[PDB]
Amino acid sequence: LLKKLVNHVLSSGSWISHLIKLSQYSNIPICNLRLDSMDYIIDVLYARKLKKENIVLWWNEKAPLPDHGGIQNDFDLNTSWIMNDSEFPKINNSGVYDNVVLDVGVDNLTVNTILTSALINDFVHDAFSNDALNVLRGMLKEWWDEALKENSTADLLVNSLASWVQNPNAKLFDGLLRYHVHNLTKKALLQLVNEFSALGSTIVYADRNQILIKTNKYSPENCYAYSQYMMKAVRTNPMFSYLDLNIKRYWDLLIWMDKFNFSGLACIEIE
Amino acid sequence: SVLAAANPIYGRYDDLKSPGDNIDFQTTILSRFDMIFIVKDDHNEERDISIANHVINIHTGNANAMQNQQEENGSEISIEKMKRYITYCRLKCAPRLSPQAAEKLSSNFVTIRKQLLINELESTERSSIPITIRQLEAIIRITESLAKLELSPIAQERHVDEAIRLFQASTMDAASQLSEIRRFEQELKRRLPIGWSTSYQTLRREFVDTHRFSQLALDKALYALEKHETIQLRHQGQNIYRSG
Amino acid sequence: NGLDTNNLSHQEQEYLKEYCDLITDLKSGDLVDIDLSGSLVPPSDVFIDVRVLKDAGEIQTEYGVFNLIKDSQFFVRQSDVERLIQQGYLQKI
Amino acid sequence: MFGSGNVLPVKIQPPLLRPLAYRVLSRKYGLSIKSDGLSALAEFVGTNIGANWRQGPATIKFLEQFAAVWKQQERGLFIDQSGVKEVIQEMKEREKVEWSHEHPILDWRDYFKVINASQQQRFSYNPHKMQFIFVPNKKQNGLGGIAGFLPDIEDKVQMFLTRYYLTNDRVMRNENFQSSMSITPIKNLLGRDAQNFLLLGLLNKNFKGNWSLEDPSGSVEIDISQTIPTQGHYYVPGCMVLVEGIYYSVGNKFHVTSMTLPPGERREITLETIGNLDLLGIHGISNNNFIARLDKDLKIRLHLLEKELTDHKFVILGANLFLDDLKIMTALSKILQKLNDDPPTLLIWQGSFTSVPVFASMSSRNISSSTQFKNNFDALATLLSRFDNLTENTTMIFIPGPNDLWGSMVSLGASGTLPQDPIPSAFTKKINKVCKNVVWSSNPTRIAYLSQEIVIFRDDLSGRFKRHRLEFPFNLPQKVQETRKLVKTILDQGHLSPFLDSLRPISWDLDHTLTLCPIPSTMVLCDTTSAQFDLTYNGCKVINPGSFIHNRRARYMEYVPSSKKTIQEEIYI
C-alpha cells in the first residue's frame, strides 16, 4: 500500500498532462470531463454535431433509456425485441481439414462496419434516424482522418466508440442505434464470408475477432504468398478498407468442433 | 353410415398441383359426404421416426404388451365393450340442441360460407369441395353424436366447439388446399432490409392507398413470403419482420 | 356425512350445514347410547372379516389401536369398524 | 382465555384415555382419531386438568366442544395433530372473545396478515359450472424451476377470457340488464344486416390497424365516427366496454352509436353472489375438497372489534423516494423523527428506491449499481437504528417501485411484468437485523387488517391512461374531474391495470391478484403522475399520495380504518 501511495504521488503528473491534452481537443472543461469514462466526451461531441444539424437530442442523464419525448417507460414488444436480443450468429463448420487453415484476427470490426454504412446498403419502425447516423458516420470519418495524424485523443475516441455504443451508462444509449449497429455487423460479417468465398476460400469459424478459413493450398511454404495476396485483395475491397486483419496462427492439419474444442498442428511464424 | 376411402386421380396428392386436378369426383358426392378428410405425407423427421418406432413395436410384438397393459390401465376398451356401447348409445340416447347452441352453429355456418367466398374469389372457378346446407346438417349430426358419446340428452356448447373443430380439421382444411407478386416481392425486399420490421398499417397505406397493387395481392403475397420463411410475422401479427 | 360443493346453491349449502348441525345435535343429550346416523342394516353377524382398501394410517378404536395398512385383513366386530366401512376405507361383507 | 387450573400439569398418556376417546366424540359425533392427534389431545388435557383427568367432566365437555368445532369447519374426517393445534389456537381466540363477553374490558396481530401476489390463492370463473372454482397453488408442486416463473402455455389463452366472463357476470347482475337491451355474442352479429345490437367487447386494434371488439366467440371490426361516449370515463385499448350500435354486412363493420363501461357492483353484493368465500384466507386455507367459508358472525365480531380499536393509524408516505439523494435523506430523517414522537401501526414504505435504474454497468473499478443499492439500504438501516420506537412498535411493509432492482434489471426502468416481485432478501439483510417485523411484498399487495381487505399498488396510471386514451371526432376543477374519471374507470373494470398485453405484460399464473373482481373496501393507488386525492366510490376507498416531494415538501398520510378517515399532512422540508 505504501508502494501504491508513492506510485500515485509520482504518477499524478502524466495523468494531469493527459487531462490537458484531452481538454485541448475535446473542448470540455478539465474539471467537468470524466477521464475514467471515455463515453462522456463521445456523447457531448456527438450531441454538439446533432445540435449543429438541427435535430432533437435524446440526451437522458439519470436513466439508460432515451428521452423519446417523455413517452418512454412504456412497454412495447418492438423495443423489447430490438433491445433484448443480443446474439451474434457464429458460423461453425466441424470436421478435419488438411489445407493450411488460416487464423485472422479482425480488429475494428464495429468501427469499419459503422464507418462504411453508405456502402453496406449497396417508415421502418425499428430503424434508427438516418440523418443522425449520417452525422455519426461523417464524424467517425473525421475522427479516423485525424487519427492518422497521430492524435492520441482521436485514437482513443475511435477505439472507444465501440464501447460507447454497447454502454447503457452513456447519455445517448438508444436501443435502436445499438440494434442498427449489431444488424449491420451481422451483414458485414456475412459479406466478409462471401468475399472470402469469392476468392476460393471456405471459412471454418467466424466471430467478432477470430476468423478461421480453409484455403486451397496444402503446405504453408506454398501458401504464404497466396495468403498475403488474399488479405491484400480483401483490403482492396471498398466495403472493407478500415478492417485490421492480422494473421495470428498458421494451422497445417486441424480438427474443428468449435472454439472451445480444437486440436491439431500449428506454427505461429513461417520459417 | 358410409365410410369410403380413396386416392386422388393423380398417383399421390400433390400440393403443387391444383385441388381441382386431383379430384375428378362430382361436387354432388362431396356434398353427400360429411367429413372429407384429405390426408398428406409431409415427411417430417419426428413423425417418420415416431411411426418407425411404432410399427417396429407392432411387428416385434411389444405393442401387444403395451395395449394389454393399457387396457388394464383403463384408458382403452376392447372391441366387444365398445361394440355394445355403440349399440346402447344408439338405442338409448337421441339428443336435441340447446337454444344457445343454435346461435353458435348458425354463426359458424355463415362464417365458413363467408370464408368460402374468399376461397372462391381469386381462383375464379368453382371449388371441387363444396360447403352447402347439408354440411350444416353434418355439423348438427356431429354435435348430436358428441352428445351421444356420454348419453347426454342435451347437446351443449362444449360439444359444439368440438364439432366445429372437427369440421375445420376435415372439410375447411380440405377446401383450403403475375407481375403483382414478383413486383411486390422485389419492392418489399428492397423496401425493408434484413433484420428490420414494418407495421401492417404502413404497408396498407403505402401499397393499397397508393394503389400500387390490390389488397388481395398483398394478403396473398404476405403468406407467400411467410411460407418461404425469409420474411415472417411477429408481435401478434401486427409486425412484419425479415428473418434474413 | 352423519356416519362436491359446486352443484349446491349457497342457500342449499347453508341448509345442508345447519341440517348437519341438527343431526349431530340429535345424537347428543338424549338418544346418545345409540347413534342416529348409524347403520340401518341389522347386525346379524357380530364378527366379520374386513379388508383394507386404502392406506389411512394408524387409527384408534374403543380399547385397542388399529392399523390401516393397504390390503390387510382384520377379523373384527362389525360395530367397531362399521363407521369405517361407511367411509369406504374398509370394505368387506 | 381458559379457566384457571389450581393443580400443576401432568403428562398423561394415550393409554388409559382409551375409553375416553372413542365413545365421547368418535361415536357421538363420528370423527376418527389418529395417534398423533390423540397424543396432542392427551397432552392438552393433561396441561388443562392435571390429576383429575380421570373423574373430570371438563375433559368430556372439552372433547364435545372439540368434536363440535371440527363439525363446523369439517376440515377432515380424521383428526390431525396440526389440526388439533389449529383448533386449540382457534379455541384460545374463541374463549378470549367469550371472556371479553363475560367481563367487558383478542389481538390485532392474530388476524392481520400480508399476502404477496405470489402467495394469493387462485380463482377462475366457469360459466359451464356457472360459478367460481379455486385452483390449488403449484409453487410447491414440481421442481422450483418449473413452479417458479414458468406458467402453463394455456394460461395466456385463458386469462382474457376469464376476465371476459367475469365482466359478463358483473354486467348481467346489474338491474339495467336483468330492462334496456341484452348482450349478444359477437360471432352472431355477422349476418344480421341493419339491426341494433348491444355488446360487451374487448376493445382492440387488429392487424389491419382498425378498431375491433372481441369475445371468446370471435371478433368484429367497428368504427368510432358516430360514437357518443359517456362523459366521466377513460377508454384505452384493453378495455371491455359496452357498445351499442348497428352492424352492417356490406363491409363487415359495426357502427357504434354509444359506448360505455359496465357499471360497478359493491363489495357485499359480490360476496353474497359468491356466497361469502374467504378469498384472502382469513380463517385457515381453502383445500381441493372443501372451500373455505367466511363466517357471518366472525365477520360481525371482527367489525365490532375493528370499531373498538380506534387508535390504530396507517402512515403512508408519498411514493418515488430516492435513497441516494441527500435532501430526501434529511427529509426522511425529519419525518421519521415526527413518527418517532408517536409510532403508528403500519408504516408502508414504497416507491422507486433509487433514482437511476440498476443495470449491468462496465465500470469495474467503481462500486456497482447493485452495490450502490446495497449501500443505500445499509444507510437506511443506519438511520433506522437511531429510532427505537419504529423498530419496536411499528411493522413496516415494503412495496417495490417501477425502478427497483429486481424487476427493472432487464426492463431498465421501463414498464415490465405487472406483478413485480419483492426486493431480494440478500440485498437488504441489515434491515432484517433492525426491524422487529418487516414484510417485503410484491407490487400488488393484499394486506388483511381484521375485517378490512387493503390493496396496495404502485404504478404510474394516469400518464399511460392519458397517452393511449381513445380520441374521437365527435367529443369543475380539472384535477378533481380527472381523479373521478380515473377512479371510476379502475373500479368499473374490476382490474388494477386494464391495458393490453402489448402495453404492459402480466405474468400468466398470477393475474387473479391483479383481477379485482372482489372490490376491496380501501385500496391505495400510488400514481406520481397524478396529484394526491382521496375518494370513495361504490363502497371502495381510493387514496393517492403521488410523488414524495412536491415543491420542497414531503407528503404523508394518516389513515384510520375505524372511522375510515385519512388526514393529509405535508412537511415543509
B197/A124 CB distance under 8 A: yes
Which residue reads 355477422 in cell numbers?
D190
Interface of D with C (CB under 8 A): 14, 18-19, 21-23, 26-30, 32-35, 38, 64, 68, 71-72, 77-78, 129, 131, 133, 272, 275-276, 289-291, 293
The distance between the two most distant Cα atoms of chain A, rounded to a whole number of Å, is 64
D22/C61 CB distance under 8 A: yes
Residue type (1 letter), D220: V
Q: Are D433 and D455 in contact (CB under 8 A)?
A: no
| DSSP conformation class of D564 | T
A78/B194 CB distance under 8 A: no
Q: Are D561 and D312 in contact (CB under 8 A)?
A: yes
| Euclidean distance between CA atoms B143 and B153, whole angstroms | 11
Which residue reads 384505452 in cell numbers?
D236
Please indicate if any CB of chain B lies within 8 Å of the CB of D218.
Answer: yes
Residue type (1 letter), B79: I
Q: How far is CA D296 from CA C14, D284, D302, in A?
A: 12, 15, 10
| Euclidean distance between CA atoms D207 and B215, whole angstroms | 14
φ, ψ of residue D473 to 5 degrees: the values are: -75, -40
H helix intervals, D180-325: 267-274, 296-308
Residue type (1 letter), B89: C
Choose the closest CB to D34 out of C28, C58, C63. C58
All 3 cell numbers of residue A86?
A: 443480443
Chain C residues with CB inside 8 Å of D293's CB? 13
Write out the H or E segment, with its range, that includes residue A254. Answer: strand A244-258
Which residue reads 350445514 in cell numbers?
C17
| Euclidean distance between CA atoms D504 and A80, whole angstroms | 12
Q: Are A126 and B196 in contact (CB under 8 A)?
A: yes
A62/D356 CB distance under 8 A: yes
| Euclidean distance between CA atoms D33 and D23, whole angstroms | 11
Choose the closest CB to D30 out of C2, C32, C61. C2
- Name the B residues in 172-201 with CB < 8 Å from any D CB: 199-201
Q: How far is CA D571 from CA A201, D327, D443, D557, in A?
A: 75, 13, 26, 11
Choose the closest CB to D208 out of B106, B110, B200. B200
φ, ψ of residue D377 to 5 degrees: the values are: -65, -35
Name the nearest CA neighbour of D222 among D247, D239, D242. D247
Write out the H or E segment, with its range, that includes residue A228. Answer: helix A220-235
Which residue reads 341493419 in cell numbers?
D194
- Name the B residues in 214-243 with CB < 8 Å from any D CB: 235-238
The residue among D183, D184, D207, D208 with the most chain B CBs within 10 A of its CB, best to mutate, is D207
Non-local CB neighbours of D402 within 8 Å, separated by 6+ positions: A73, D352, D408, D413, D415, D416, D420, D458, D459, D460
Name the nearest CA neighbour of A212 among A135, A110, A97. A97
Q: Tell me the sheet residues that pair with A107.
A: A244
Instruction: Measure CA D404 to chain center.
Output: 21
A73/D402 CB distance under 8 A: yes
Q: How many CB atoms lie within 10 A of CB B58?
A: 13
Which residue reads 396507517 in cell numbers?
D314
The distance between the two most distant Cα atoms of chain C, rounded to a whole number of Å, is 44
Q: Are A164 and A170 in contact (CB under 8 A)?
A: yes
A77/B193 CB distance under 8 A: no
Write out the H or E segment, with its range, that includes residue D40. Answer: helix D35-49
Which residue reads 429510532 in cell numbers?
D387
Q: Tell me the sheet residues that pair with C75.
A: C49
Q: How many residues does chain D have?
A: 573
CA atoms within 13 A on the CB side of B127: 21
Strands B154-155 and B96-97: parallel
Q: Does an interface of 3+ CB pairs under 8 Å exist between B and A?
A: yes
Q: What's the gap in Å between the CA of D252 and the closest CA on chain A?
A: 29
Burial class (CB in 10 A: 0-12, 13-18, 19+), C70: exposed
Q: What is residue D257's three-state secondary structure?
A: strand
Choose the closest CB to A64 out of D363, D412, D504. D412
Question: Long-range contact list for D93-101, CB < 8 A, 24+ apart?
Answer: D95/D1, D95/D2, D96/D1, D97/D301, D99/D1
Write out the H or E segment, with its range, that includes residue D126. Answer: strand D122-126
| Euclidean distance between CA atoms B6 and B13, whole angstroms | 11
Q: Does an interface of 3+ CB pairs under 8 Å exist between D and A?
A: yes
| Euclidean distance between CA atoms A146 and A156, whole angstroms | 11
CA atoms within 13 A on the CB side of D112: 15
Tell me which chain C residue has its CA closest to the CA of residue D290. C5
φ, ψ of residue D385 to 5 degrees: the values are: -70, -20
Burial class (CB in 10 A: 0-12, 13-18, 19+), D515: buried
Return the axis-axis angle of helices D35-49 and D81-102, rounded to nearest 10°. Answer: 30
Q: Show me where chain A is broken: residue before each gap, C-N > 2.5 A.
A: 122
Interface of C with D (CB under 8 A): 2-6, 10, 13, 20-21, 24, 27-28, 32, 35, 37, 56-65, 83-84, 87
Subunit partners of chain D (3 or more CB pairs within 8 A):
A, B, C
**For residues D495, D500, D505 and D510, what is the CA-based torsion angle, rounded to 10 degrees?**
40
Residue type (1 letter), A37: S
Q: How far is CA B153 from CA B98, B142, B144, B150, B162, in A?
A: 10, 14, 9, 9, 17
Please indicate if any CB of chain B lies within 8 Å of the CB of D208.
Answer: yes
B237/D207 CB distance under 8 A: yes
| Conformation bin of residue D264: beta by default, left when phi > 0, alpha when psi is -120 to 50 | beta
Residue type (1 letter), C79: S
Q: Are A204 and A101 in contact (CB under 8 A)?
A: yes
All 3 cell numbers of residue D106?
A: 383478542
Non-local CB neighbours of D133 within 8 Å, separated by 6+ positions: C6, D123, D124, D125, D126
Instruction: Measure CA D354 to chain center.
Output: 25
Q: Are D371 and D422 in contact (CB under 8 A)?
A: no
Please indicate if any CB of chain B lies within 8 Å of the CB of A194.
Answer: no
Cα D286-D292-D297 angle, rounded to 5 deg: 150
C5/D291 CB distance under 8 A: yes
C32/D133 CB distance under 8 A: no
Q: How many CB atoms lie within 10 A of CB B35?
A: 13
All 3 cell numbers of residue D571?
A: 412537511
Strands D395-398 and D218-223: unpaired
φ, ψ of residue B33 to 5 degrees: the values are: -75, 150
| Euclidean distance between CA atoms D522 and D314, whole angstroms | 12
| Euclidean distance between CA atoms C80 and D309, whole angstroms | 52
Q: What is the DSSP string of A209-226?
A: SEEEEE-S-SSHHHHHHH
Chain D residues with CB inside 8 Å of C84's CB? 32
Q: Are D49 and D5 in contact (CB under 8 A)?
A: yes
Q: Show me where chain B is broken: residue before each gap, C-N > 2.5 A.
A: 177
Q: What's the gap in Å between the CA of A183 and the closest CA on chain D?
A: 21
H helix intervals, D103-210: 144-147, 155-172
D188/B238 CB distance under 8 A: no
| Euclidean distance between CA atoms D70 and D64, whole angstroms | 10
Q: Are D98 and D2 in contact (CB under 8 A)?
A: no
Which residue reads 371490426 in cell numbers?
D221
Q: How far is CA D524 from CA D351, D389, D542, in A?
A: 13, 25, 5
Q: What is residue D569's three-state secondary structure?
A: strand
Write out the H or E segment, with its range, that includes residue A189. Answer: helix A175-197
SS3 string of D443-482?
Answer: CCEEEEECCEEEEEEECCHHHHHHHCCCCCCCCCCHHHHH
Q: Are A40 and A34 in contact (CB under 8 A)?
A: yes
What is the Cα Rg of chain B in Å? 23
Q: What share of chain D is helix, strand, coil (3-state, %, to 5)?
A: 35, 20, 45
SS3 string of chain B?
Answer: CCCCCCCCCCCCCCCCCCHHHHCCCCHHHHHHCCCCCCCCCCCCHHHHHHHHHHHHHHHHCHHHHHHHHHHHHCCCCCHHHHHHHHHHHHHHCCCEECHHHHHHHHHHHHHHHHHHHHHHHCCCCCCCCCCCHHHHHHHHHHHHHHHHHCCCCEECHHHHHHHHHHHHHHHHHHHCCCHHHHHHHHHHHHHCCCCCEEEHHHHHHHHCCCCCCCHHHHHHHHHHHHHCCCEEEECCCCEEEECC
| Conformation bin of residue D450: beta by default, left when phi > 0, alpha when psi is -120 to 50 | left
Strands D540-544 and D533-537: antiparallel
Choose the closest CB to B239 out of A78, A183, A186. A78
φ, ψ of residue D75 to 5 degrees: the values are: -70, -20
Subunit partners of chain B (3 or more CB pairs within 8 A):
A, D
Q: What is the DSSP string of D492-561?
A: HHTBS----TTTS---SS--TTTB-SS--SEEEEE-TTS--EEEEETTEEEEE--BSBSSSEEEEEEEET
Non-local CB neighbours of D115 within 8 Å, separated by 6+ positions: D280, D281, D441, D445, D446, D447, D448
Q: What is residue A242's three-state secondary structure?
A: coil
Name the nearest CA neighbour of B133 among B147, B119, B112, B103. B112
Q: How far is CA A173 from CA A83, A178, B20, D548, in A?
A: 11, 8, 58, 28
| Euclidean distance between CA atoms D216 and D125, whole angstroms | 14
Which method was used?
Answer: cryo-EM
Q: Tell me the sheet residues that pair with A254.
A: A97, A264
Write out the H or E segment, with its range, that includes residue D247. Answer: strand D240-248
A125/B206 CB distance under 8 A: no
Q: How far is CA D86 from CA B153, D79, D207, D276, D428, in A?
A: 47, 11, 56, 22, 33
Residue type (1 letter), D492: D
Please indicate if any CB of chain B lies within 8 Å of the CB of D157.
Answer: no
B204/D187 CB distance under 8 A: no
Q: Tell me the sheet residues that pair with A95.
A: A256
Tell me which chain D residue has its CA closest to the CA of residue A170. D361
What is the Cα Rg of chain A in Å? 22
B108/D185 CB distance under 8 A: no
Buried b (16+ CB within 10 A) or exposed e, C4-34: eeeeeebeeeeeeeeebeeebeebeeeeeee
| Euclidean distance between CA atoms A140 and A117, whole angstroms | 11
Tell me which chain D residue has its CA closest to the CA of residue A74. D415
Name the nearest CA neighbour of D60 among D74, D48, D71. D48
Subunit partners of chain A (3 or more CB pairs within 8 A):
B, D
Q: Are D230 and D165 in contact (CB under 8 A)?
A: no
Q: What is the DSSP string of D59-107?
A: HHHHHHHHHHHHHHH---SS--HHHHHHHHHHHHHHHHHHHHHHS----
Cα D496-D498-D499 angle, rounded to 5 deg: 130
Q: How many residues does chain A have?
A: 271
Tell me which chain A residue has its CA closest to the CA of residue B195. A183
| Euclidean distance between CA atoms A89 and A177, whole angstroms | 19
D187/B107 CB distance under 8 A: yes
All 3 cell numbers of residue A170?
A: 452513456
Beta-carbon contacts below 8 Å between A and B: 33
| Euclidean distance between CA atoms B203 and B186, whole angstroms | 14
Q: How many CB atoms lie within 10 A of CB A195?
A: 16
B195/A183 CB distance under 8 A: yes
| DSSP conformation class of D176 | G
Q: How many residues does chain B have?
A: 244
Residue type (1 letter), D534: D
| DSSP conformation class of A118 | H
Name the nearest CA neighbour of D176 among D203, D194, D161, D198. D198
D412/A76 CB distance under 8 A: no
Question: Long-range contact list for A60-68, CB < 8 A, 24+ apart?
Answer: A60/A171, A60/A172, A61/A171, A62/D355, A62/D356, A63/D356, A63/D357, A63/D412, A63/D413, A64/A168, A64/A169, A64/A173, A64/D357, A64/D359, A64/D412, A64/D413, A65/A173, A65/D357, A65/D412, A65/D413, A65/D414, A66/A172, A66/A173, A66/A174
Choose the closest CB to B200 out of D128, D207, D218. D207
Chain D residues with CB inside 8 Å of C64's CB? 18
| Euclidean distance between CA atoms C88 and A53, whole angstroms | 86
Domain, as residue range, for C58: 40-93
Q: Does an interface of 3+ CB pairs under 8 Å exist between C and A?
A: no
Cα A191-A193-A195 angle, rounded to 5 deg: 70
Q: Are A90 and A205 in contact (CB under 8 A)?
A: yes
φ, ψ of residue D447 to 5 degrees: the values are: -100, 130
